[PDB]
């Protein structure tokens, strides 16, 4: 079809201009609760980890898709290997508070402590970017922090999550005319 | 020869009118939403003065600039006019943009620029121009048009912001097509803003200097 | 709703399983492309 | 021994409280005349936010002043919030006065003050102060009261007026019977006005200085 | 009523769980908040 260019409208032309028949399509893959609903690993620091998961490698699945939104929300699972007991705190804690018991602490079982933790933030929505210092992200956008006397792995899986205005989402850039792989093969 | 394709646009007391218009971009919604939260105990109040169009020179698009060329304009900007005082005198606002960008050269120039409004814009890196498209946004391509024209609401982590400390929308203008003048076409093509905040709401009287 | 199967109900409440959404007062990328322009624009022939 | 005559007076986001009221002074008028009249040609607006009250100090009663010391405050006055800003960026404006008076000494001092809202008052003759009852008025009598109340419309030879050039209305307190301490009366009293612009409207909007 | 969550009804009786209550014959800081004075005092002016 020829539309105007310089407008913006979406033009969607299908196969039947020239005589071919649109198929049905089935897009539950790219459903964006779907498709964030999984672990992803992240590299924890010794003891203090705040759970931010701007941490998810932007290379990920994860990571490069929560960056192509600008604006998020969700809810958190974590798994943790770790020494010791954990202790979860809020969004709003004193640091000190990682040492209290009282504030939601899972006592060793091995081989890894899975949690549901809500969000915890005081905005209604956090944001992958944001325009203030121009990098550094306010501190309230964290979903708290946790503690445990060594932490060995991490993983964040986000629940519920909801994504607002679309932003670049980037693949590898071939050096020769397509990129080409060792795809698994029998 | 020339268009009747003809628009007027009004806010406030001043108008801007174009005939060769293309239509405008609504981006992400078509109205705002709630501007009375919890945040603001009920005190906000709409200062319908402040809704009106300003104007701002952007940059000039000569020929050899090229893909990827671009002016990044933050939003809220200086404003020396109502719109401008409320930010000394109001803790929080909030407001959306109705922007128009002027490039007139004549028809007789080739060469393209994109206009997107995108927010939280703290800076953008060359591969992801390749996608400035996902934004609210509308070309300016000279054989066809000469105004761009996007509206955009309020958004942003918070009800209400603190304009003096975060910008939640950038306007950028970028060249796709690199401009020609060959031998009728205008030599160089000024961009031009003219821009109204809508919908401006105000929350927390500042003491004065006094 | 996302990547969950179990056909039996949570033994928890939703109170502690979720976060509780609170009201005031594909939303706009699917009435985008929804809305796109499908059709021809000349006269066709044949 | 103190007393249940208590009223709260709120001007906006600004609220005012006192326990010996005396009750209010109307001047001229309940209500004001039509602020819509064919010198603005429909293009006048109400601005809310400047309706609310702004202080400051008048003189301080002694007992060496007597009778006919008087203090006078042209109204509108310097203002460094929100109405002051509308006087820069309107040509024209309108608005009536809501004006109350303090002077806090004790119950154990006598003496008088009589408060008016004179319209024109370019300057008084001594004979004159005489009649000043004509004028909206109350008084201020240590053994009652210590707040006066008069709320005052718009009034002019025009419907809008030009407040660079003229000022309608002064705010007058005049010494009619001296000051008296005697034992257990406060020193002497400073006499204060706290004040809020009531309906302003604007029309004729100013360039900025950019 | 504290903090629980389970949907499922207890395994146990309710005699096993918790002491029982006996009865002879927010209470206070609740009806002493609600009864709490939220006017004006004076005559009010616009």
Known sequence: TTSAGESADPVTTTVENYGGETQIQRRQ????????????????????????LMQVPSHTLVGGLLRASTYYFSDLEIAVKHEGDLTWVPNGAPEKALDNTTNPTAYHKAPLTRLALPYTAPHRVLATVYNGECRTLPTSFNYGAIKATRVTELLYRMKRAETYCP???????????????????? | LLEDRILTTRNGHTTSTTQSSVGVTYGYATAEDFVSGPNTSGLETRVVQAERFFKTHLFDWVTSDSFGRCHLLELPTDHKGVYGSLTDSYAYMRNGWDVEVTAVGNQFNGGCLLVAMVPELCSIQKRELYQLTLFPHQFINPRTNMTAHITVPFVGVNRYDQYKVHKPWTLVVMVVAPLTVNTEGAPQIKVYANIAPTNVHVAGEFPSKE | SGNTGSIINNYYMQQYQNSMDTQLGNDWFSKLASSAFSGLFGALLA
């Open chain 1, 29 to 52: 893959h790219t459903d964006v609760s779907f498709i964030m609903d999984r672990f992803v690993k992240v590299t924890p620091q010794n003891q203090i980890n705040i759970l931010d």
């Open chain 1, 167 to 186: 932003r670049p989402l980037l693949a590898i850039h071939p050096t020769e005319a397509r990129h080409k792989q060792k795809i698994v093969a029998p």
